[PDB]
Amino acid sequence: AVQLHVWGPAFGLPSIDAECLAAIAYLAQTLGSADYQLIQSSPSAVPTQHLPTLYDSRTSTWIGGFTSITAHLHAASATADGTAYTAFLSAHAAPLLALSLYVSSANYGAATRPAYSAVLPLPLPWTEPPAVRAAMARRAAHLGLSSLKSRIRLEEAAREVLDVLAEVDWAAGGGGRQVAAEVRCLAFGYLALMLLPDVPRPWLREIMEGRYPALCTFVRDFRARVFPQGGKLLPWADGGAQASASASASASAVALRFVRAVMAEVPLVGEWWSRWWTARKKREVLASKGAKPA
Amino acid sequence: MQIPRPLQRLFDYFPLRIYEPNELPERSQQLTSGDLPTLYVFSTDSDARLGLPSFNPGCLKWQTLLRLANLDFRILPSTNHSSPTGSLPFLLPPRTSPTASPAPIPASGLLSFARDLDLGHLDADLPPRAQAYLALITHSLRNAWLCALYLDPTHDALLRRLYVDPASSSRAVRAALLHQLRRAAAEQVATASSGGGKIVSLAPVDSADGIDEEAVYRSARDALDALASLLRESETAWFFGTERPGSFDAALFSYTHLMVEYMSEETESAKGRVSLGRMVKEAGNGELAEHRERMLGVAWPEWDGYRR
Amino acid sequence: STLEVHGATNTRRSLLDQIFKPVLTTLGQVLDRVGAATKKLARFDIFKEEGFGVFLSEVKEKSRLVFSAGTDFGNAEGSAYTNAVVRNIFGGAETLTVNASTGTRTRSAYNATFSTPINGNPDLRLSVEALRSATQKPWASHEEHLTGANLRLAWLTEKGDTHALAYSSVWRQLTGLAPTASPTVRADAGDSLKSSLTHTFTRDRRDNPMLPQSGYLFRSVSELAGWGPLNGDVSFAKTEVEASGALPVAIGKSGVSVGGGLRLGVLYPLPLGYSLTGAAQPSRINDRFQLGGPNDVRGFKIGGLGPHDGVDAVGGDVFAAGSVNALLPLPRTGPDSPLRLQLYANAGRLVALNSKGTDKEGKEGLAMDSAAVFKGVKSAVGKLTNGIPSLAAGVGLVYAHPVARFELNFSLPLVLRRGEEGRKGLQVGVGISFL
């Protein structure tokens, strides 16, 4: 009865963001084909404004984020390391992505821009991919590196994460430390979006394929197991992949999305409108959880 | 074609009677006289004389690390604008002459100036599993501290009496300072995806409605449980089987001490959200409060009166 | 005879009623009254300066919005601005808006000024400013982001002298200590409010305001920071006096005009309420006195000649600076264009405060009663007259442009206090009021 809201299946993976992709993998592993809908959407089309979002029709609840989604639908060193890696992936591993594929114009605009365009409506790609690039450029801070013999720094900033994720035994029946059933999906999502894309300017693919055999094998096995031939067999919306965004397909809705996005960018009266809109949407979200704001 | 400067060589010798220096003013002879290195933190004015812990977890870590390193220094309050970088906890060596002071030492090199026997246990490459938790402290508990202190109307008095009272002593400036503080806090907490990664127009979400006051608190509670479960595998009352506490114990103490001290009040108890101090005291069976109280036995042995 | 009916298109007759009301033996009385009336309508701003004339019995409004670009001069070689004036709203009122990026020294400004004449008289210009700035001060390495707003009241009487009763309240954030600064600056960065009440008197009786020849310029300033009624966080009492001069002697009427100058000042820290005794915190770096540069004392850098903390020039409570000008003419040219020679020997001392007289206080030494700071000021002024002053000399080629007195001098210092960074020749001054 639940209904997800994710990105597009562009890269051959059901999303182009590790959060919603991992949510999709989790739902596919735990629920069953006859429970969810995987409605494709965009961030501006949900009250949460955070894309991976559940919608449980039993009580009409909006639940943004991935950890809050897995909060619903639910020795001790196992779960302790589970939480530890759940928090270590959401930071220092998402900014390792955004060091490529989202900030470097040499790599963003050759595979990422058409991928984003092929999942959005007609007039919207004007404004939202800029917001997402700004977001991933903010997250890629605290790293000292930007769009760029100044190459060893890349190898170092990649090892400082792949070595922590290395001695983990991310998918098997025995080894170093078995983590959990949930966070494995998150690691799959992040390592997939770190390895699988076509990436016309690759610098992570060679490092991974030539230094960490466990990561490549883990990603390939997890993709071939639960996501057959691009995950098109997943229970997408009634129509199809592109036909998924039918609940917000009216020209009026897309026009409203575009005009909000452009009005929230004017010099001076933009910040106030953005704050007011975010406040109203959060009030709506809280009212969806049976709460009572002012 | 660059030739040297004029070579007439008669411009010199003109300064006739070079007299004695100019005897720096009053407000630069008491605040900067100095007999020992002078660490600058967010401490109070009374606490600065005895060396009590600060109330900024970014400076309590370095203050604790330096006290563990068997270094004798002073503590003076500051206001975060006077620092080689943007962040405050920097150190200043003492003066060699009343008209010269060596270069400041920022927060990234304090434990390099502190070297007397073995300063290796305080800055070393952690085990690969250790960072998996050192990222659990700096990114979940930090966002909890922020969202609880700055963006919580129940903790308005605490913020207003810690951060904006010793700043201006004027109302119309206190207001703008509080606003800038809360804006920077909401912007810094709304970046780590544990709290909220809402996507708006091309400007970070600096508002009390970008994050949600549920996910941060829940991730903080999970982080405290995981840290307690890691501590219960110690056998030496310190995290990684080490006799003397290193950088990890100090990094955790920085937040644990303040969460037990300031945000640890008993009010209605119906709101559901229990103060972070209670979560620290209840994580596991009390394994974190005991670690905290043991940290005040290698750092502040001559002090008493904590827990509130 | 003929009451006022002409020219009252935009302005009010009530305002024009009192400007010449007492028009009430026959040969030259009216000829003097018209000369008084035109000189009264001259210090206004509404009437147009071109056709400011009225025929013997038996103009129009200037504009409403006057933009401009211009380039002012505030002792910094670079500047800019964009005014937006409104030469009338109700009576003879006004407003204004300057956006002076100002280039070199400062980096912003926004002055939403609003003047007005009070009670008929056209001189009581009770301005109400609301300013803003972010000025860079490279002699004590930091910026300063003023965000104040004052309520000034000026009055120019019929003898050239002026007045002021400003009431400022600023914010004064020092937020620029990125490069190597001195710990005195670090111990001062922060905030303030500095709600004050000043008073500036100036009997400018000179002929060429950019090149004095026969006048004499007395000009006093008396600040008073937070105290008693007007509160804040800083508390002091600051005064400053200047007395320039110039006088020709003899040879034709060739310009010789030997002149001199002088500058005095004091900074007396005070208690913080309705008294003269009690705790008195010393002065900050926002309030102390700078003295140097090509303008006030030539031969030294733009912030030198004071208590130095290494490479940063913190201020000093009390000071005194003098000068001697020559202003000789060009060789075989005459009373031609303002390009004239110059010879000078600039002096001046600046020493800060200190106690050095009582150690029983021990803890929390940043508090002194009236007796302590009094003896400190006595010791400072005693140290002011023990030793040869700075006494730097040099020559320069003045250029008395109508707005800016370009100098292009070449000077050398003679008496220095070790660590004062005295300039050595080839400096290029510019400003409004030199020493």
Residue numbers in the entry:
A (entry chain C): 2 to 75, 105 to 178, 237 to 382
B (entry chain A): 14 to 128, 139 to 289, 292 to 333
C (entry chain B): 47 to 70, 78 to 111, 132 to 324, 329 to 512
Can you provide the manuscript's text about this entry?
The SAM complex facilitates outer membrane β-barrel precursor protein folding and insertion into the outer membrane. The SAM complex consists of one copy each of Sam50, which spans the mitochondrial outer membrane, and Sam35 and Sam37, which sit on the cytosolic side of the membrane. Sam50 forms a 16-stranded β-barrel which is minimally closed between strands β1 and β16. The structures of Sam35 and Sam37 reveal that they each adopt a GST-like fold, which is also completely different from the BAM lipoproteins.
The cryoEM structure of the SAM complex in lipid nanodiscs was reconstructed from 179,509 particles and yielded a 3.4 Å resolution structure. The resolution was sufficient to allow ab initio tracing of a majority of the folds of all three subunits. In lipid nanodiscs, the SAM complex is monomeric and contains one copy each of Sam50, Sam35, and Sam37. Sam50 forms a 16-stranded transmembrane β-barrel with a single POTRA domain extending into the intermembrane space. Sam35 and Sam37 are located on the cytosolic side of the membrane, where Sam35 caps the barrel lumen of Sam50 and also interacts extensively with Sam37. The orientations of Sam35 and Sam37, as well as visualization of the lipid nanodisc, suggest that Sam35 and Sam37 interact peripherally with the outer leaflet of the membrane and residues 339–353 of Sam37 form an amphipathic α-helix that appears to interact with the membrane. In this structure, the highest resolution is observed for the Sam50 β-barrel and for Sam35, with lower resolution (and more flexibility) observed for Sam37 and the Sam50 POTRA domain. When the map is filtered to low resolution, the first of two predicted transmembrane α-helices in Sam37 is visible; however, it is not visible when filtered to high resolution. It appears that the relatively large size of the lipid nanodisc compared to the Sam50 β-barrel prevents optimal particle alignment and further resolution improvement. The reduced resolution in this domain in the lipid nanodisc structure further illustrates its mobility.
